[PDB]
Write a protein that binds this ligand. Sequence first.
Ligand SMILES: Nc1ncnc2c1ncn2[C@@H]1O[C@H](COP(=O)(O)OP(=O)(O)O)[C@@H](O)[C@H]1O
Ligand SMILES: Nc1ncnc2c1ncn2[C@@H]1O[C@H](COP(=O)(O)OP(=O)(O)O)[C@@H](O)[C@H]1O
Ligand SMILES: O=C(O)c1sc2cc(F)sc2c1Cl
Ligand SMILES: O=C(O)c1sc2cc(F)sc2c1Cl
Ligand SMILES: O=C(O)c1sc2cc(F)sc2c1Cl
Ligand SMILES: O=C(O)c1sc2cc(F)sc2c1Cl
Ligand SMILES: O=C(O)c1sc2cc(F)sc2c1Cl
Ligand SMILES: O=C(O)c1sc2cc(F)sc2c1Cl
Lengths: 319, 319
Amino acid sequence: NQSAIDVVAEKPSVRLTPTMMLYSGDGSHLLKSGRYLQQELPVRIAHRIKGFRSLPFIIGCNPTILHVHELYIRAFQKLTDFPPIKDQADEAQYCQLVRQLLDDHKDVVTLLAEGLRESRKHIEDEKLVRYFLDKTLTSRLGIRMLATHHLALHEDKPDFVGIICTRLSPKKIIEKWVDFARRLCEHKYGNAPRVRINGHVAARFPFIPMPLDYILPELLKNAMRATMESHLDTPYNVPDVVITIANNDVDLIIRISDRGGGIAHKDLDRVMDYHFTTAEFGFGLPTSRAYAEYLGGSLQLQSLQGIGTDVYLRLRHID
Amino acid sequence: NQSAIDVVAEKPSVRLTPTMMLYSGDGSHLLKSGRYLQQELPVRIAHRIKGFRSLPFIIGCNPTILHVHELYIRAFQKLTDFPPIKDQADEAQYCQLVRQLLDDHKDVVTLLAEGLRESRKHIEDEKLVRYFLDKTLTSRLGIRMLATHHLALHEDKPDFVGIICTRLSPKKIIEKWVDFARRLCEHKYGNAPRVRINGHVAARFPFIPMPLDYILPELLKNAMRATMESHLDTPYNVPDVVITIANNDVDLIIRISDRGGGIAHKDLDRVMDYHFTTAEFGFGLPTSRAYAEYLGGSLQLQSLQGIGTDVYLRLRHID
Ligand SMILES: Nc1ncnc2c1ncn2[C@@H]1O[C@H](COP(=O)(O)OP(=O)(O)O)[C@@H](O)[C@H]1O
Ligand SMILES: Nc1ncnc2c1ncn2[C@@H]1O[C@H](COP(=O)(O)OP(=O)(O)O)[C@@H](O)[C@H]1O
Ligand SMILES: O=C(O)c1sc2cc(F)sc2c1Cl
Ligand SMILES: O=C(O)c1sc2cc(F)sc2c1Cl
Ligand SMILES: O=C(O)c1sc2cc(F)sc2c1Cl
Ligand SMILES: O=C(O)c1sc2cc(F)sc2c1Cl
Ligand SMILES: O=C(O)c1sc2cc(F)sc2c1Cl
Ligand SMILES: O=C(O)c1sc2cc(F)sc2c1Cl
């Protein structure tokens, strides 16, 4: 066992405010920020190692689960071996290790789902598995936003302070993912539902697109697939998917309404479980919910069995 | 104190199934049903007397609350003094007392809200008050359906077995209350939102209209009022209220969508409390929710602050 990991496995995380990210974004400010990252990332990694150590032995023993645990141990070793950042050249050296770790851990979610799939015969508690996956994936999301934000601060990209867009239009980010989903849908069925966008279509505000880039294609794929499966007898005459944007001082709400038949009563208690899918890998819906909650929001579903489903994505604002 | 009340205050209620109501509905069947009512009503009344006896003393002491408690004691005395139903003439005698008690207790909800309003300075628990009102009003709803159903069984009214409509159209019962709400709305503002009805508009099925006759005008008044208050600057150009009917083997779902600005974040935790209203008596929403839950369903709200509100009324089917 590694005693260095034990030293910070229970140290509370120091949270960088999404408002503080705008406040610091530069040369001398990049150094203070890089010093923060250097000290904070091993703590976040150690909290994840603690999670793998706390798994029931028969699950933690899985070679795929063990491989992810060992990747986290490797990441902690590499981040802690690095000398302190005294100057901007030291700050730059560190950035290249962060880029390497961002790519080395690209498939962690895939590996975890694989390991847990192979260990399904030893899982008697979906609430324990939900806790492990919600905690692991949201904390990994937090590590990724910190890492990507710091790297992006080195660019003079328009309307962006790192990963924060200063003038994010929800209508534009929704339109981008609607085009992507309609193309995949059209390839599979020969047609895709037309998507209408209404509400506060002219809203623009400081926002981090990363969560929306994950959640939006997941909800659009679900609404479009349910609409096509529900109308196989009339595939070229399908009802529209309606998206409403509601923007207020507190949060952004995105409502996605489909006429895809609804989520059956028997399936409604399982649609938010990991691995659960009625398609022919069940991670889109529980991961989107855990991400929205991690960011101060929520993901709620309202089923109208025989008609369709309304999905409400609520995300707390920057300020 | 009355010892007869004590004898049945904890006796469990025997539930008449909404399916059993169709199964019995006649002369000899009316007698067995009237015998059931005679024995069941004092038990339901005694459960309510127990509720008034269990209120904190400072609240139960209120003369308005005491007047309702004393009305229930009177109803128990009158129902128990009546001799057993040996024949159809005895069954008919009992019906006339039930009619009198139905009218004598017409305003019980009004009296209870008044008594609790005068005792607000001594209420430190909205969860206790919610429990008392949810239990009292839903059990009173149950007493009223039993009483009205038995009386209605004496009629040869088309498409009705007592209070059960054998071919209830949700679109027709919604249209009836839309006309009522639009007229009241037009009187107050000079205009009312146009109501569109979609989904399963041709659905017809066995159903008891009584719950819908209470809940529908409450949700329509709220959706229409919020729409008019939200558009005072353009009172003759207001967005439509959209109602969707979803009918499946398990339940009927009625979605009411408005563009009335939404329910504010500060008010969202209080809209389901009794007495809470932002209008210039806050019972419509908590009573509708308690009624829908009492009948195996639910009443759920989804707020899009800055845009509008979606209300979902779910009611379990007869079978
Ligand atoms: N809009 C919707 N309409 C109908 N069914 C839906 C909808 N959204 C989700 N579902 C159901 O929830 C299930 C779980 O979805 P999810 O967890 O996102 O994973 P996956 O996309 O792999 O199926 C889906 O397989 C589908 O049965
Ligand atoms: N559709 C809606 N749009 C906006 N506000 C609503 C809506 N439905 C309910 N509300 C809010 O909830 C409050 C409580 O409603 P309710 O309990 O039905 O009582 P009341 O009709 O006496 O106000 C309302 O006063 C209003 O502020
Ligand atoms: O992140 C954490 O703090 C923890 S504690 C714990 C216990 C488990 F069984 S999984 C798990 C995780 Cl993921
Ligand atoms: O699990 C991940 O996705 C990542 S990305 C990244 C960048 C770092 F600097 S550590 C680290 C980890 Cl642990
Ligand atoms: O039917 C399917 O299986 C799929 S997968 C997918 C991904 C998208 F973005 S849309 C879409 C559809 Cl419609
Ligand atoms: O119906 C009941 O069984 C009861 S028990 C109880 C305790 C209270 F404080 S009110 C109340 C009611 Cl309404
Ligand atoms: O509270 C009420 O609304 C009613 S109506 C009715 C009819 C009866 F026969 S008893 C009784 C009561 Cl207790
Ligand atoms: O604005 C109001 O106060 C009211 S009260 C009422 C009752 C109805 F049925 S509609 C309606 C409206 Cl719109």
